[PDB]
Enzyme design. Structure first.
Site, mmCIF file in Angstrom:
data_model
loop_
_atom_site.group_PDB
_atom_site.id
_atom_site.type_symbol
_atom_site.label_atom_id
_atom_site.label_comp_id
_atom_site.label_asym_id
_atom_site.label_seq_id
_atom_site.Cartn_x
_atom_site.Cartn_y
_atom_site.Cartn_z
ATOM 1 N N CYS A 1 0.767 -1.120 -0.025
ATOM 2 C CA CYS A 1 -0.068 0.050 -0.041
ATOM 3 C C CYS A 1 0.987 1.228 -0.112
ATOM 4 O O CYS A 1 1.555 1.654 1.033
ATOM 5 C CB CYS A 1 -0.845 0.123 1.222
ATOM 6 S SG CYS A 1 -1.987 1.485 1.061
ATOM 7 N N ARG B 1 -0.069 4.483 2.867
ATOM 8 C CA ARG B 1 -0.014 4.374 4.273
ATOM 9 C C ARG B 1 0.396 5.817 4.963
ATOM 10 O O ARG B 1 0.130 5.429 6.335
ATOM 11 C CB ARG B 1 0.872 2.998 4.711
ATOM 12 C CG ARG B 1 0.274 1.817 4.272
ATOM 13 C CD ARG B 1 1.179 0.972 4.613
ATOM 14 N NE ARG B 1 2.299 0.606 3.371
ATOM 15 C CZ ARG B 1 3.423 0.057 3.617
ATOM 16 N NH1 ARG B 1 3.757 -0.230 5.031
ATOM 17 N NH2 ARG B 1 4.295 -0.176 2.609
ATOM 18 N N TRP C 1 -8.931 6.013 -0.842
ATOM 19 C CA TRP C 1 -9.324 6.670 -2.333
ATOM 20 C C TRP C 1 -8.389 6.316 -3.517
ATOM 21 O O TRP C 1 -7.222 5.938 -3.004
ATOM 22 C CB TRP C 1 -9.362 8.228 -1.980
ATOM 23 C CG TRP C 1 -8.084 8.829 -1.535
ATOM 24 C CD1 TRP C 1 -6.915 8.743 -1.982
ATOM 25 C CD2 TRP C 1 -7.873 9.379 0.072
ATOM 26 N NE1 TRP C 1 -6.108 9.711 -1.108
ATOM 27 C CE2 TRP C 1 -6.811 9.893 0.045
ATOM 28 C CE3 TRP C 1 -8.862 9.137 1.086
ATOM 29 C CZ2 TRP C 1 -6.243 10.326 1.070
ATOM 30 C CZ3 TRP C 1 -8.543 9.830 2.199
ATOM 31 C CH2 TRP C 1 -7.135 10.478 2.444
ATOM 32 N N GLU D 1 -4.487 3.468 -10.957
ATOM 33 C CA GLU D 1 -5.078 2.559 -10.628
ATOM 34 C C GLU D 1 -6.103 1.993 -11.885
ATOM 35 O O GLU D 1 -6.397 1.218 -12.548
ATOM 36 C CB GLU D 1 -5.862 2.483 -9.324
ATOM 37 C CG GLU D 1 -4.887 2.335 -8.225
ATOM 38 C CD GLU D 1 -5.587 2.367 -7.128
ATOM 39 O OE1 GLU D 1 -5.901 1.128 -6.575
ATOM 40 O OE2 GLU D 1 -5.492 3.184 -6.394
HETATM 41 C C1 HEM Z 1 -6.318 6.892 1.792
HETATM 42 C C2 HEM Z 1 -6.136 6.382 0.422
HETATM 43 C C3 HEM Z 1 -5.379 5.315 -0.275
HETATM 44 C C4 HEM Z 1 -4.616 5.125 -1.007
HETATM 45 C C5 HEM Z 1 -4.385 6.280 -1.874
HETATM 46 C C6 HEM Z 1 -4.254 3.841 -1.149
HETATM 47 C C7 HEM Z 1 -3.325 3.473 -2.283
HETATM 48 C C8 HEM Z 1 -3.090 1.955 -2.495
HETATM 49 C C9 HEM Z 1 -2.494 1.628 -3.844
HETATM 50 C C10 HEM Z 1 -2.252 2.360 -5.165
HETATM 51 C C11 HEM Z 1 -2.694 0.206 -3.768
HETATM 52 C C12 HEM Z 1 -2.282 -0.669 -5.073
HETATM 53 C C13 HEM Z 1 -3.760 -1.270 -5.467
HETATM 54 C C14 HEM Z 1 -3.552 -2.304 -6.737
HETATM 55 O O1 HEM Z 1 -2.708 -2.216 -7.503
HETATM 56 O O2 HEM Z 1 -4.488 -2.889 -7.135
HETATM 57 C C15 HEM Z 1 -2.904 -0.130 -2.385
HETATM 58 C C16 HEM Z 1 -3.016 -1.455 -1.991
HETATM 59 C C17 HEM Z 1 -3.509 -1.899 -0.641
HETATM 60 N N1 HEM Z 1 -3.968 -0.998 0.184
HETATM 61 FE FE1 HEM Z 1 -4.016 0.877 0.011
HETATM 62 N N2 HEM Z 1 -4.341 3.070 -0.247
HETATM 63 C C18 HEM Z 1 -5.352 4.053 0.571
HETATM 64 C C19 HEM Z 1 -5.975 3.222 1.650
HETATM 65 C C20 HEM Z 1 -6.014 2.047 2.292
HETATM 66 C C21 HEM Z 1 -6.626 1.388 3.294
HETATM 67 C C22 HEM Z 1 -7.815 2.641 4.115
HETATM 68 C C23 HEM Z 1 -6.199 0.154 3.689
HETATM 69 C C24 HEM Z 1 -6.887 -0.658 4.736
HETATM 70 C C25 HEM Z 1 -7.343 -0.070 5.691
HETATM 71 C C26 HEM Z 1 -5.381 -0.036 2.793
HETATM 72 C C27 HEM Z 1 -4.864 -1.490 2.621
HETATM 73 C C28 HEM Z 1 -4.231 -1.816 1.378
HETATM 74 C C29 HEM Z 1 -3.985 -3.226 0.985
HETATM 75 C C30 HEM Z 1 -4.192 -4.299 1.936
HETATM 76 C C31 HEM Z 1 -3.368 -3.177 -0.272
HETATM 77 C C32 HEM Z 1 -3.051 -4.486 -1.036
HETATM 78 C C33 HEM Z 1 -4.063 -5.004 -1.441
HETATM 79 C C34 HEM Z 1 -3.790 -6.165 -2.674
HETATM 80 O O3 HEM Z 1 -2.853 -6.822 -2.349
HETATM 81 O O4 HEM Z 1 -4.773 -6.278 -3.645
HETATM 82 N N3 HEM Z 1 -5.063 0.906 1.835
HETATM 83 N N4 HEM Z 1 -3.149 1.083 -1.827
HETATM 84 N N1 LIG Z 2 -6.810 3.000 -3.758
HETATM 85 C C1 LIG Z 2 -7.084 1.891 -3.223
HETATM 86 C C2 LIG Z 2 -7.681 1.655 -1.675
HETATM 87 O O1 LIG Z 2 -7.748 2.789 -1.108
HETATM 88 N N2 LIG Z 2 -6.664 0.464 -4.084
HETATM 89 C C3 LIG Z 2 -7.386 -0.539 -3.876
HETATM 90 C C4 LIG Z 2 -7.447 -1.396 -5.003
HETATM 91 C C5 LIG Z 2 -8.380 -0.966 -5.993
HETATM 92 C C6 LIG Z 2 -8.054 -1.419 -7.603
HETATM 93 N N3 LIG Z 2 -6.454 -1.350 -7.851
HETATM 94 C C7 LIG Z 2 -8.890 -0.586 -8.679
HETATM 95 O O2 LIG Z 2 -8.308 -0.056 -9.286
HETATM 96 O O3 LIG Z 2 -10.084 -0.729 -8.479
#
Ligand code: HEM
Ligand SMILES: N=C(CO)NCCC[C@H](N)C(=O)O
Ligand code: HEM
Ligand SMILES: C[C@H](O)[C@H](O)[C@H]1CNc2nc(N)[nH]c(=O)c2N1
Ligand SMILES: C[C@H](O)[C@H](O)[C@H]1CNc2nc(N)[nH]c(=O)c2N1
Ligand SMILES: N=C(CO)NCCC[C@H](N)C(=O)O
Ligand SMILES: [Zn+2]
Lengths: 411, 407
Positions: free
Chosen positions: B106, B109, B278, B283
């Site tokens: 993520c 974070r 968000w 993405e």
């Molecule tokens: C506040 C805005 C946030 C942004 C901008 C953001 C950004 C991202 C991005 C770009 C990814 C890559 C997603 C992908 O390529 O499919 C990601 C993965 C992830 N984020 Fe976030 N994130 C946010 C909030 C959160 C929150 C609120 C959580 C949990 C409470 C979280 C947990 C994760 C997890 C677990 C992944 C990996 C999911 C996977 O392996 O498919 N993130 N994040």
């Molecule tokens: N920014 C986030 C969660 O805050 N990404 C979560 C996975 C979303 C996925 N990569 C999509 O393009 O629909």
């Protein structure tokens, strides 16, 4: 044990058994992955096993495993080792060795070309002047007036560690960098330290933005010596754009021959500390990294300024827009002047075909995803979507410390 | 055992000590790096609970207090007695924030401590789940000013009474294979779209149909529910320069809300824990729009742009890619829906890493996921060495429930 990799675009699953032949460690453990870390005097003892393993691989490749010629060779290397404490490769084994080091280079996207490699055997070389002559021949042969040919020149192997051959340049052809008193850099910031050494060794620097560096060559553990590559051997390309006519006025050019000269080639436990090798450029090496890295020529702002993009918010993607135009320019300039270059779409597609072929014929293809995926447009190239396994096979190219950190100056 | 990471652009070196607290395994060995692979009892439970409670009481500066020992005692007694235990609200919240903090994939974070935690452990039915979910959707969406949230359903018991959201995100678009041979809508959702249809959903069979929720309470067969469309905030995609862009008819939803993951806190397993923040623009604009196996729009866009599509070396794909991504960002911004561009997000993450190194001793990060899928090396994370390792509390993958479920 069999290991699967999947491509998430095609669902093609491949099976890796080659990784079983891996000796050298990765940097990773069961508790830590060091996959993004850049960088994560041999006795008789360790040497014969290393020789044996290599000669078994060579004799298998030529369908003579277990033959009388195989056994006589093992025996003859064995006696040479415990008698002279080292051994000499036959020419055929050196060529095979050099090709396989390239075949096994996990950070190299160009490996579909691994079997077409011109090997120049410079093991009879004794002096820095001998080295210069060898390197000139390599540049001229590899350049081939723009129709680039892959080549490697191999100087004598390490003996006691006190008689090493080294090319002090990190590439045979590269531009000087000059830290200025006001703290800016003229030329290429990556080469400031090495430039300062050349100047100390007595090079008269033209002090411009694209001065081809002199060669600083060390033979037989002696203090290194300076030489200027004849300018008629240094092929360069002025950078212009197919549509933007102001682009030429940025004053950009680059050299056509990428020739890494600071790595160490290991073959059969033998250490070849000077083994400069060259292929041809993928456009992004120059257009993305050498031009637009912040710590390199850093031209993004000046380009975007000329393009009159909205530069007040990153979310205009002015940087990304400028980046594409620069890379278009690099490719156009090289093609127009008929100098070999490959784009990152073509090169990654080739590599995926290479990699699949290798899985079928070899049982695997070690690959470092961090390095293989191009530094722009990552996910619109097929490699981004390919799972890869990274492991170290010998023969191999390895990093070694910069020679100025270790060399004992004679005076 | 004390590890250095170097930024090659700035020369800044950070020492990592947090990795020594690493519990789970990476997939890697000393012989093979698996860094680019997507998916690499009473007795078991008490160590996991103790390890968690110890870090919790340390976080509130009460390590080794009577209240620390008393809670360890009480949880211990409860596992012995009931073979599981219940987290206090304070522990639940701490655990969820830390699962995000530990999420090595993520980039977002820097926000980790601003998470609204919705405690849905009193939920008993799928209708209940639907209610909690609509509330989460409405809370987080907040008319376009998005707020991070997670909703936590009851923890696994005997694994025959699992709560699951069968959707992979709360909001996604349907996918349909046609006679054609081709795919209408989102190809990533084809199979789940079929499951909905086979469960009874009447599909409008269009390009951007919001899927229904398929919700499983207490191990029962899952049930369909439509999110009130008034709760699903969507953005029409236009370009600030190219008038024809709107004619492509593209849109996306504002709320990215992953719903198929498993939250592990102190050995307890929360199999339904949908969370949302968000979007980072790439993405949608790079991955969702341009992956060959997603909406795959590069060719239509390039045509509209009249680029030279004869040769890969004209970089037409790259040109179209930038514009599609300008259009996504512009549209979300124009409609006042929170979005972050990849330059802004990666810059924040480098700052977050420095904060974590300084205050915590490190920051697990997966460079393969953290580096944006466009313009990699012109973002600072490309030049940043990262160490990847697994800390708990965590978010984990779990198998799709249709292979698990007994109907
Ligand atoms: C506040 C805005 C946030 C942004 C901008 C953001 C950004 C991202 C991005 C770009 C990814 C890559 C997603 C992908 O390529 O499919 C990601 C993965 C992830 N984020 Fe976030 N994130 C946010 C909030 C959160 C929150 C609120 C959580 C949990 C409470 C979280 C947990 C994760 C997890 C677990 C992944 C990996 C999911 C996977 O392996 O498919 N993130 N994040
Ligand atoms: N920014 C986030 C969660 O805050 N990404 C979560 C996975 C979303 C996925 N990569 C999509 O393009 O629909
Ligand atoms: C023939 C055309 C070739 C192409 C298009 C090509 C492409 C590349 C590229 C793009 C890289 C990454 C460079 C960087 O980011 O700094 C690279 C790395 C490398 N290639 Fe090649 N390559 C070619 C030929 C060769 C040859 C002839 C050899 C040796 C015989 C070689 C061995 C390597 C090695 C060892 C690396 C890693 C360098 C490092 O770690 O700094 N390649 N290749
Ligand atoms: C820290 C990170 O490993 C480093 O920036 C790497 C990333 N990938 C790379 N890939 C290539 N081909 N060349 C490089 O120099 C780098 N740099
Ligand atoms: C094979 C490879 O691991 C896979 O394509 C990864 C690469 N990096 C990624 N990075 C992010 N943020 N999201 C992804 O889905 C992927 N996919
Ligand atoms: N294509 C090659 C070798 O055939 N790359 C060599 C490294 C060159 C370096 N990346 C540079 O931009 O000068
Ligand atoms: Zn690894």
């Amino acid at each position: 044990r069999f290991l699967k990799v999947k491509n998430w675009e095609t669902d093609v699953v491949l099976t890796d058994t080659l990784h079983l032949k891996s000796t050298l460690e990765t940097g990773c453990t069961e508790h830590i992955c060091m996959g993004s870390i850049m960088l994560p005097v041999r006795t008789k003892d360790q040497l014969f096993p290393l020789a044996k393993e290599f000669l078994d691989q060579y004799y298998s490749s030529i369908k003579r495993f277990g033959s009388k010629a195989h056994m006589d060779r093992l025996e003859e290397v064995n006696k040479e080792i415990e008698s002279t404490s080292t051994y000499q490769l036959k020419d055929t084994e050196l060529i095979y060795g050099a090709k396989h080091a390239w075949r096994n280079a996990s950070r190299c996207v160009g490996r579909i070309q691994w079997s077409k490699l011109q090997v120049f055997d410079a093991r009879d070389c004794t002096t820095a002047h001998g080295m210069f002559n060898y390197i000139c021949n390599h540049v001229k042969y590899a350049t081939n007036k723009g129709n680039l040919r892959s080549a490697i020149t191999i100087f004598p192997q390490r003996t006691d560690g006190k008689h090493d051959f080294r090319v002090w340049n990190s590439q045979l052809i590269r531009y000087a960098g000059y830290k200025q008193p006001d703290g800016s850099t003229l030329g290429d910031p990556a080469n400031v330290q090495f430039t300062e050494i050349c100047i100390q060794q007595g090079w008269k620097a033209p002090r411009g933005r694209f001065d081809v560096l002199p060669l600083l060559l060390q033979a037989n553990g002696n203090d290194p010596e300076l030489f200027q590559i004849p300018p008629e051997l240094v092929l360069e390309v002025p950078i212009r754009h197919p549509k933007f006519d102001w682009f030429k006025d940025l004053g950009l050019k680059w050299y056509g021959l990428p020739a890494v000269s600071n790595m160490l080639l290991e073959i059969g436990g033998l250490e070849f500390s000077a083994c400069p090798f060259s292929g041809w450029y993928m456009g992004t090496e120059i257009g993305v990294r050498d031009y637009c890295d912040n710590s390199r020529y850093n031209i993004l702002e000046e380009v975007a300024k000329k393009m009159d993009l909205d530069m007040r918010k990153t979310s205009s993607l002015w940087k990304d827009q400028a980046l594409v135009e620069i890379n278009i320019a690099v490719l156009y300039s090289f093609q127009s002047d008929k100098v070999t270059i490959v784009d990152h779409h073509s090169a990654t597609e080739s590599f995926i075909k290479h990699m699949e072929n290798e899985y079928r014929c070899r049982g695997g293809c070690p690959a470092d995803w961090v390095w293989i995926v191009p530094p722009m447009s990552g996910s619109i190239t097929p490699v981004f979507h390919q799972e890869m396994l990274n492991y170290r096979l010998t023969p191999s190219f390895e990093y070694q410390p910069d020679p100025w950190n270790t060399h004992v100056w004679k005076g």
